[PDB]
Amino acid sequence: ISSETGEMGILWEFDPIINKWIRLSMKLKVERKPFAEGALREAYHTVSLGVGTDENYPLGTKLFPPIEMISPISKNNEAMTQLKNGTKFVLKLYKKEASRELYFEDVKMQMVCRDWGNKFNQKKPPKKIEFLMSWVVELIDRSPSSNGQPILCSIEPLLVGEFKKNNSNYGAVLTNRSTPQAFSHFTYELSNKQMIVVDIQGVDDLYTDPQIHTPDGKGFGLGNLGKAGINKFITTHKCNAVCALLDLDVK
Numbered sequence: 001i002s003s004e005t006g007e008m009g010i011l012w013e014f015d016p017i018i019n020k021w022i023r024l025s026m027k028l029k030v031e032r033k034p035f036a037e038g039a040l041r042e043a044y045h046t047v048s049l050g051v052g053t054d055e056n057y058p059l060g061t062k063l064f065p066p067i068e069m070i071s072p073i074s075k076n077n078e079a080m081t082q083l084k085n086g087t088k089f090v091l092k093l094y095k096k097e098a099s100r101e102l103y104f105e106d107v108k109m110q111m112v113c114r115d116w117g118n119k120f121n122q123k124k125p126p127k128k129i130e131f132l133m134s135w136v137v138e139l140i141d142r143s144p145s146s147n148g149q150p151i152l153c154s155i156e157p158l159l160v161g162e163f164k165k166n167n168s169n170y171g172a173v174l175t176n177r178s179t180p181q182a183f184s185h186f187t188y189e190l191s192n193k194q195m196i197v198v199d200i201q202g203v204d205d206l207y208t209d210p211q212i213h214t215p216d217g218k219g220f221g222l223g224n225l226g227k228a229g230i231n232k233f234i235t236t237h238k239c240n241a242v243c244a245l246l247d248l249d250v251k
């Protein structure tokens with residue numbers, strides 16, 4: 001949309017309720033230096049210069065995600081309000097030394113957790129939670145890295161405030177707060193033990209970068225540690241007033 005200097009990107013949004021990816025474009029201006037780093041990625045402040053369609057950037061014939069997983073229509077999406085021209089947000093790049101599939105899997109995983117957030121909030125707990133949207137962006141104006149595969153990154157809204165990690169994906173309980181731990185326990189019980197959401201982290205109860213474990217270990221990226229991840233959560237978990245309010249089993 002905007003005529004100002006920045007760079008273009010193909011923007012991908014996953015929508016769980018129709019089970020499709022929605023493909024868009026946007027222009028963005030990203031700062032030169034990151035403002036934070038974790039173990040694997042760096043985060044950069046970025047501003048949006050508008051969201052558009054992908055009609056100038058045809059797909060052609062090896063596509064991931066596959067064509068049947070892509071919505072033919074993209075007129076409605078969260079990006080058009082949440083990343084509208086002017087918005088400050090965050091872009092995350094992996095450090096030098098992540099396949100194409102994993103960017104998409106991590107964004108899908110976050111959208112799945114966001115759904116679990118809504119389901120938890122429907123039980124009217126004392127504190128509601130929310131997982132941020134997340135999106136894949138192909139930075140198409142940048143030079144390809146080792147191959148004709150473009151530069152990929154993920155983007156999400158800016159969290160304002162003190163960022164805290166509340167548990168990890170392997171059993172750590174890092175704060176005293178109840179709601180995070182009760183949420184993890186909720187996802188375990190109400191999924192009939194088919195999955196658990198951990199790596200609950202963010203600002204207050206606005207969360208981002210969660211991790212799912214499933215018993216069979218498949219999908220949900222490299223952080224999916226299977227039954228081991230699940231058992232490690234169980235070992236350290238102490239039920240709290242929120243667990244009890246949600247009528248969860250003290251097993």
Ligand SMILES: Nc1ncnc2c1ncn2[C@@H]1O[C@H](COP(=O)(O)O)[C@@H](O)[C@H]1O
Pocket residue numbers: 036037038039040041042043090092156157158159160163208209
């Ligand atoms: N959405 C966000 N808004 C603001 N800060 C963030 C956000 N996500 C992550 N951070 C911070 O940036 C660091 C690097 O991101 P991560 O790759 O998720 O570890 C985190 O450890 C946080 O301190």
Ligand SMILES: [Zn+2]
Pocket residue numbers: 181182185237238239240243248
């Ligand atoms: Zn509990």
